[PDB]
């Protein structure tokens, strides 16, 4: 039944994402790619979001499979702090890459003055600062306790305050970066569309931009939607809802699994770097 497919699914997601991200990180570190604004932003997204989210997947897998928390008290807080820190760093780095793309497409020559690697490192520091500000109280949002006769790692937070943090993390981490990517890529696609090779290149760029935006929307949508359903509707407890929970967690991890593929590994330039490192 489900007990034999759940850990297999989580391990599959873990493996695919970890392999892809080790590839992307190795290529971006010592594939010959010198420091540059686009490389810094893609590297940030790769390492931070993707490696850390999938390194924290096993623990939610143990939540769904092992019947009880077994990692103590320091982990029961640090793990969830890391999970939400790197979700926030994910969304912020996606927004930063979108704005950086608009700058490097619409103003190819003056952004060259603006988009120095120093400003890229400043922007990375800023997105990390906002992420650590936003995922702060998650360091105490999740606490260990004893439920029935068994150890558990669960939200220890008053329902109003727990709802407040749920709403806040949703609105910021999802809505603000999704708004930024949507607006910025809409303006970029508008500007690009105003020879056969030129038409083909524009078609390829449009397809890739659409794929990125659709990923960042659709992959993280179900998780936040389900949490909002929990807080703002009659959410029953059913095997159907258990399947939905597994599906939401799986697609949330799938965003971070396919980000290294979509941003980097499907371009021949990145592949050439990978061939060089091999």
């Amino acid at each position: 039944p489900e007990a034999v497919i759940v850990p297999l699914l989580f391990a599959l997601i873990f493996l695919v994402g970890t392999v892809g991200n080790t590839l992307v990180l190795a290529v971006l570190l010592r594939g010959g790619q010198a420091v540059s604004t686009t490389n810094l932003f893609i590297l940030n997204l790769g390492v931070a979001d993707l490696c850390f989210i999938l390194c924290c997947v096993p623990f939610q897998a143990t939540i769904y499979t092992l019947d009880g928390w077994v990692f103590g008290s320091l982990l029961c807080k640090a793990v969830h702090f890391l999970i939400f820190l790197t979700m926030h760093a994910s969304s912020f780095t996606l927004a930063a890459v979108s704005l950086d793309r608009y700058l490097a497409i619409r103003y190819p020559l003056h952004s060259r003055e603006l988009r120095t690697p120093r400003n890229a490192l400043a922007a990375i520091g800023l997105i990390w600062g906002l992420s650590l500000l936003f995922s702060g109280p998650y360091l105490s949002y999740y606490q260990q306790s004893q439920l029935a006769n068994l150890t558990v790692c669960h939200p220890a937070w008053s329902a109003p305050r727990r709802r407040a943090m749920d709403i806040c993390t949703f609105v910021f981490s999802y809505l603000l970066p999704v708004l930024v990517l949507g607006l910025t890529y809409a303006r970029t696609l508008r500007y690009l569309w105003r020879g056969s090779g030129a038409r083909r290149a524009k078609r390829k760029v449009t397809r890739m931009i659409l794929i990125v935006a659709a990923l960042f929307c659709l992959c993280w949508m179900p998780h936040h939607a389900l949490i909002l359903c929990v807080w703002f509707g009659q959410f029953p407890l059913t095997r159907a809802t258990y399947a939905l929970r597994i599906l939401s967690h799986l697609v949330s991890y799938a965003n971070s699994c396919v980000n290294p593929i979509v941003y980097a590994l499907v371009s021949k330039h990145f592949r050439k770097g990978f061939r060089t490192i091999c």
Binding site: P1, L66, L147, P155, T238
Partner: peptide, 16 residues
């Protein structure tokens, strides 16, 4: 197969 652990993990210790 909503285990006590997971059912609490989504809902909360107040109403598991």
């Amino acid at each position: 197969g909503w285990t006590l652990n997971s059912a609490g993990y989504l809902l909360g210790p107040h109403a598991v």
